[PDB]
Amino acid sequence: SGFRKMAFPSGKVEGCMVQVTCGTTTLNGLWLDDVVYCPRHVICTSEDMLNPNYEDLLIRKSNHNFLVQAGNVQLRVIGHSMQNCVLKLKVDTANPKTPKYKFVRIQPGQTFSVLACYNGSPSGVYQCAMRPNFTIKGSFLNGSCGSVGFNIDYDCVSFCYMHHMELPTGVHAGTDLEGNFYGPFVDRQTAQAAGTDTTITVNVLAWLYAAVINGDRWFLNRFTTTLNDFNLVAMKYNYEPLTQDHVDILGPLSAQTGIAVLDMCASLKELLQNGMNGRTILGSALLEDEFTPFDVVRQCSGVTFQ
Amino acid sequence: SGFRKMAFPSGKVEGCMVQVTCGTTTLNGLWLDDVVYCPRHVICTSEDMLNPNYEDLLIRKSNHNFLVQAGNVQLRVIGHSMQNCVLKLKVDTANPKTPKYKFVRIQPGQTFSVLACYNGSPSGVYQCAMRPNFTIKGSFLNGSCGSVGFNIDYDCVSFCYMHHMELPTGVHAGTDLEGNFYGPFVDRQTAQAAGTDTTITVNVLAWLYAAVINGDRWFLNRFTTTLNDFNLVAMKYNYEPLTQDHVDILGPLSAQTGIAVLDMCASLKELLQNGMNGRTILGSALLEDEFTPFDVVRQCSGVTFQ
Ligand SMILES: CC(C)(C)OC(=O)Nc1cccn([C@H](CC2CC2)C(=O)N[C@@H](C[C@@H]2CCNC2=O)[C@H](O)C(=O)NCc2ccccc2)c1=O
Ligand SMILES: CC(C)(C)OC(=O)Nc1cccn([C@H](CC2CC2)C(=O)N[C@@H](C[C@@H]2CCNC2=O)[C@H](O)C(=O)NCc2ccccc2)c1=O
Ligand SMILES: [Cl-]
């Protein structure tokens, strides 16, 4: 037993990280088969980032202006193209460590592991949620651009995130691996509103089921509620409305614990109205929303990869 | 910016995990050079674990009774020995993925990454502290025994922990890689007291410095205190006494922030007496003690490995 914010084992991704340098700027790239993916802002100076014309900036660059290093190994660039906000550098060597992989665009409220990298070198791994407002609350310093987010399914790495920027509010924005930003963000150093964030209700409920499974039961009450009554409460506390799709995804946790989803909603309701009264749930003094229902099942059933 | 509970990249350790089976029991082993390390309780039945005579149980086992599998690869066992609570299985093949490594016995309050494994297969990575009472609050299910804790320094993996058991209170106990338990625990299914745990004061102070560096400053007050006055407060709230060695380790964080360690102690004092008044620090509603001073420096300076 016990419950931890667990990241995927990072080894398959570690083998794909490289350093990419263009003029003055170095950041991380992702080397899969004979393509290296990195943020297109690798071609910008600090001045350019204020208001970049990426098409005009990229026209000045040739293959030989992209320095790509895998460890101490220099890769030869034989092609470059821009796809949305990412650069694809064709190289003359397929990465021998290329894992089975897919590119996925994740939904808001879904979770993934970030491998924070500097100069092509892995420094740390952590688990986070795509916020409803399409930001992430990460840990990123200079040089971390090009760091990637991912999920693993047995032997398949599903890349979902590439780090592009820190907003002036200190939260993080980036793209899928086709270079499409999550949310309204652009790769420009300008004020950008992220808009109202909300709590991921289905995740909080999943984590309450995890708590019950681990013997943290104090918040279970004598009450039930309705989807509509609960959503009146969710609206007031800036929680995502719960839908029947959410109820359906929680079904297996309901089944094991014998706690009807709407009964757990009444427990959540009472926590939102009353607070935690100085107590904790799975060692947290707030309601945790960075576990999906799928996360809780995996952890509570100890599912592995390779 | 931002601050996350980050684990080490796990790839170097993933390459060392194997499955070990003896009679009915399978768990994880650690394959370094031509030795596989695993918990000696691999030789026990459920009945044996009640009151094992490990010397008498091991005498019944021969090399060929230890089934060791690295992926789909069967390793040949040419030697076995018991060292304290671990078994060392000599195998006829050196692990080609053996990273540079050391065996270390860590101090209470030090942190490390756990790679949770089942049947020799990595499932997840998370960061935790060795509690002052020599337990860890992990996430471990059946089959996770032999999972290891570690730190990385550039290219060197320092193994510090091997998972042996869950106490009836739901916390976790294990050994260094020489098989010596952390704390008073034995590898027997019997009631075992862990004794009073305490909060790791130097870690909480390190995390308050991390908060200030990230712009979370609300808890900074107009007060200072003395080491003795602060330790009167630490005693009352079951915090570890702060020593001048702790003050010295915090020096670099003091220097950058301009906040004298004893001023930060007065902030901590006020938080312990007054509580958080429904506010958060780096997205936590309680005082976090699973970051060392060394952790905060690494993260706040973005230090990498290979
Ligand atoms: C003085 C303190 C507060 C300690 O640091 C900064 O102001 N740092 C930065 C200010 C402005 C830009 N950056 C870098 C680019 C370096 C100036 C040349 C930057 O934005 N780097 C990161 C991503 C950011 C940094 C903090 N958190 C993040 O996620 C990224 O790796 C990158 O390469 N961005 C492209 C880029 C290139 C030039 C100018 C801006 C951005 C900084 O690190
Ligand atoms: C019914 C529920 C509550 C869901 O599960 C259990 O009671 N589980 C277990 C009860 C008793 C023992 N174990 C295993 C051993 C299996 C029975 C054969 C066990 O202790 N396994 C783990 C470590 C534990 C399990 C939970 N958290 C941990 O850290 C370990 O991998 C191992 O191999 N231990 C050696 C061992 C061998 C035989 C009997 C006890 C222990 C269990 O998993
Ligand atoms: Cl909390």
Side-chain angles (χ1 to χ4, degrees), chain A residues 1 4 121 137 166 306, chain B residues 1 4 121 137 140 166 306:
Chain A
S1 71
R4 273 288 183 170
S121 288
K137 319 183 90 73
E166 188 171 299
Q306 294 260 125
Chain B
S1 71
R4 273 288 183 170
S121 288
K137 319 183 90 73
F140 291 108
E166 188 171 299
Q306 294 260 125

Side-chain angles (χ1 to χ4, degrees), chain A residues 28 116-123 139-145 147, chain B residues 299 302-304:
Chain A
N28 309 281
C117 297
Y118 299 85
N119 308 136
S121 288
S123 74
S139 174
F140 291 108
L141 297 166
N142 182 28
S144 64
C145 291
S147 291
Chain B
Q299 184 164 169
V303 153
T304 66

Side-chain angles (χ1 to χ4, degrees), chain A residues 1-11 14 115 118 121-128 137-141 166 170 172 280 283 285-286 290 298-306, chain B residues 1-11 14 115 118 121-128 137-141 166 170 172 280 283 285-286 290 298-306:
Chain A
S1 71
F3 206 74
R4 273 288 183 170
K5 194 169 287 176
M6 212 174 281
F8 292 97
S10 62
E14 289 168 51
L115 179 69
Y118 299 85
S121 288
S123 74
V125 67
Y126 61 89
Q127 184 78 169
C128 64
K137 319 183 90 73
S139 174
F140 291 108
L141 297 166
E166 188 171 299
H172 300 115
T280 71
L286 41 68
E290 298 201 307
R298 144 211 188 219
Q299 184 164 169
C300 291
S301 92
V303 153
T304 66
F305 316 91
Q306 294 260 125
Chain B
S1 71
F3 206 74
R4 273 288 183 170
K5 194 169 287 176
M6 212 174 281
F8 292 97
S10 62
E14 289 168 51
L115 179 69
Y118 299 85
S121 288
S123 74
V125 67
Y126 61 89
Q127 184 78 169
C128 64
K137 319 183 90 73
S139 174
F140 291 108
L141 297 166
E166 188 171 299
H172 300 115
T280 71
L286 41 68
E290 298 201 307
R298 144 211 188 219
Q299 184 164 169
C300 291
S301 92
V303 153
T304 66
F305 316 91
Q306 294 260 125

